[PDB]
Amino acid sequence: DINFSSLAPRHGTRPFMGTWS
Amino acid sequence: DINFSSLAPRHGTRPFMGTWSDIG
Amino acid sequence: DINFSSLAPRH
Amino acid sequence: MATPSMLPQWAYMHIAGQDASEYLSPGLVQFARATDTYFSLGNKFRNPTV
Amino acid sequence: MSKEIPTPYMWSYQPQMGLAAGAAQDYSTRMNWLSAGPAMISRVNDIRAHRNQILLEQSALTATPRNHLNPRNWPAALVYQEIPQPTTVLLPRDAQAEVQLTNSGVQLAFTPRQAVLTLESSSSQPRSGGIGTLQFVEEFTPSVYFNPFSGSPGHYPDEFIPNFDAISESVDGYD
DSSP states (O other): OOOOSOOOOSSOSOSOOOEEO | OOOOOOSOSSOOOOOTTOSSOOOO | OOOSOOOSOOO | OOSOSSHHHHHHHTSSSOOTTTSSOHHHHHHHHHTTTTSOOGGGSOOOOO | OOOSSOOOEEEOOOSOSSOOOOEEEOOSOOSSSOOSOTTOTTTSHHHHHHHHHHHHHHHHHHOOOOSSSOOSSBOTTSSOOOOOOOEEEEEOOOSSSSSHHHHTTOOOOOOSOOOOEEEEEOOOOOOOBSOOSTTHHHHOOOBOOSSTTOSOTTSSOOTTSTTEETTTTEEOOOO
16 A cells, blocks of 8 residues: 555544433 | 142143143 | 054043 | 145044044944943044144 | 146245245145045045135235246345334443543542433344245245146246246256
């Protein structure tokens, strides 16, 4: 590939959100 | 008489068309 | 062995 | 109907169906019982067990 | 036209490309052998009449309309969905109001404010493929062909042949 540096995804885990109870 | 006794005044009621007497 | 149940009508 | 399709064959040949004492004519049933003590006819017939 | 009232055709089973692996005559039944009496012509072929009649009724009630004996692929609507239903997760933590506490020097190993989050979730997309084994029985009630191989070829069941492919209309078995 010729890369020596990861990406960041630039977004945290889970888009999908739940209501407070 | 050192002994036991069990549910026995009721019997296998099955027909000669099914080995199981049903339950509702 | 043991094959079949009672094959006689109960009289 | 929606019943098993081997049911008519079984019923006839006593693999399933009704006890030979509901299948037999009523007069034969009482004949067998009367002469049960010296001339068994019980082993000449099948009871379906299912 | 009518050649007997014939024995039904029993379909075989297979690990499903969408075929039923052809069908073949039932030979685990009598009603077409010999030795009895001539008074059993309406006592043994009334039996065979009754078996076939129960089959026509049975097939009609439980089987979806089709233009083919073996469709080779049932639609997504007609596979019968046994996929799960929705479910709820009670999420165990704050990570936006119990993290300024750890920045404030607190080590951790429900005492802060009563924020608790519930999350919903669903289940998979429709699948199309072969039919299930519970629904094979209802889709493949035995068939009675009443005028065996009568008429032109092209109305003959070729889907009782366990070598036939109906999406190329050829029989190839590599033998």
